[PDB]
Swiss-Prot record, chain A:
Species per Swiss-Prot/TrEMBL record: Homo sapiens
Keywords: Acetylation, Biological rhythms, Carbohydrate metabolism, Cell cycle, Cell division, Centromere, Chromosome, Cytoplasm, Cytoskeleton, Disease variant, Disulfide bond, Glycogen metabolism, Hydrolase, Kinetochore, Manganese, Metal-binding, Mitochondrion, Nucleus, Phosphoprotein, Protein phosphatase
Function according to Swiss-Prot or TrEMBL: Protein phosphatase that associates with over 200 regulatory proteins to form highly specific holoenzymes which dephosphorylate hundreds of biological targets. Protein phosphatase 1 (PP1) is essential for cell division, and participates in the regulation of glycogen metabolism, muscle contractility and protein synthesis. Dephosphorylates RPS6KB1. Involved in regulation of ionic conductances and long-term synaptic plasticity. May play an important role in dephosphorylating substrates such as the postsynaptic density-associated Ca(2+)/calmodulin dependent protein kinase II.
Designated name of the protein: Serine/threonine-protein phosphatase PP1-gamma catalytic subunit
Subunit structure: PP1 comprises a catalytic subunit, PPP1CA, PPP1CB or PPP1CC, which is folded into its native form by inhibitor 2 and glycogen synthetase kinase 3, and then complexed to one or several targeting or regulatory subunits. PPP1R12A, PPP1R12B and PPP1R12C mediate binding to myosin. PPP1R3A (in skeletal muscle), PPP1R3B (in liver), PPP1R3C, PPP1R3D and PPP1R3F (in brain) mediate binding to glycogen. Interacts with cyanobacterial toxin microcystin; disulfide-linked. Interacts with PPP1R3B and PPP1R7. Isoform 2 interacts with SPZ1. Interacts with CDCA2. PPP1R15A and PPP1R15B mediate binding to EIF2S1.
């Protein structure tokens, strides 16, 4: 029914055009991407259990030409495996092309391309922070609501070769075992505080050692001891997360037991940060590829 | 500092 290969060709056609140049797909092609990827999301576990080699990327926030640059450096799928940590939309000027490209690769390569839920993949957040407005401007509100139904099915966490725990935000004082994540039911919005809310929203903090208050107005901060306890309980080496704007594109927290990834250089046009992607090779060795502001 | 929901 849906021509995946022609959607991707048209999305990749603007490689080497002036940044900001739109790919105006048909509404029914976009609806097709949302409904087909949703079925793929629902057939795969909510806790992904992935294997290296793998490229891990943090927030994109609709910077579509920076996503194209990440693929240039890392190899366009299926040349590399990918895990994205969420926050595909809002802030940037081309959320639509960004999420369409990622959803198209997910349909095309469903065992080699993976996407986590971020906090901007929630209707209440992407309504305010740009994605509703981009949808209204370029298509309509009904298509914005179709994306909502797709985002509600996204998986929440990943474990890479039994050693790297990946999610968007971070930890929860409610999180006792991995099984707790596993029967969070989908589709779900995030209607209350608690585990799923914390996985999308929580932040490390150097000046709390346990659990602390979060300046975002939601969820918590966690310190180095929290991370240490969690990794040792579940026999893990590293938390890989995203969610926070960092100067170098990547930043270590909690005695290098956590790393933050941010894959959108020069965020909002206003911060002068770099972007970063984490390459985990086949022998569980990590390296960082930097994308300049 | 772009507005805490987030520099
Ligand atoms: Mn986030
Ligand atoms: Mn973000």
């Amino acid at each position: 029914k849906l021509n995946i290969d022609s959607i991707i060709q048209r999305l990749l056609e603007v490689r080497g055009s002036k940044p900001g140049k739109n790919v105006q797909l048909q509404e029914n092609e976009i609806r097709g991407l949302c409904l087909k990827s949703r079925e793929i999301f629902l057939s795969q576990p909510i806790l992904l259990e992935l294997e290296a080699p793998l490229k891990i990327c943090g927030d994109i926030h609709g910077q579509y030409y920076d996503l194209l640059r990440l693929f240039e450096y890392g190899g366009f799928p299926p040349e590399s495996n990918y895990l994205f940590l969420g926050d595909y939309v809002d802030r940037g000027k081309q959320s639509l092309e960004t999420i369409c490209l990622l959803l198209a690769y997910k349909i095309k390569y469903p065992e080699n391309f993976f996407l986590l839920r971020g906090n901007h993949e929630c209707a209440s957040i992407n309504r305010i922070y740009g994605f509703y407005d981009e949808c209204k401007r370029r298509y309509n509100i009904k298509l914005w609501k179709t994306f909502t139904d797709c985002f509600n099915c996204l998986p929440i966490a990943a474990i890479v070769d039994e050693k790297i725990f990946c999610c968007h935000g971070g930890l929860s004082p409610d999180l006792q075992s991995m099984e707790q994540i596993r029967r969070i039911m989908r589709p779900t919005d995030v209607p209350d505080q608690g585990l799923l809310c914390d996985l999308l929203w929580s932040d490390p903090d150097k000046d709390v050692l346990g659990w602390g208050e979060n300046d975002r107005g939601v969820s918590f901060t966690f310190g180095a001891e929290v991370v240490a306890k969690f990794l040792h309980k579940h026999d893990l080496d590293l938390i890989c997360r995203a969610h926070q704007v960092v100067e170098d594109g990547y930043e270590f927290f909690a005695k290098r037991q956590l790393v933050t990834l941010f894959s959108a250089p020069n965020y909002c046009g206003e911060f002068d940060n770099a972007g970063a992607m984490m390459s985990v090779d086949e022998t569980l060795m990590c390296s960082f590829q930097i994308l300049k502001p | 500092x772009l507005x805490a929901x987030x520099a």
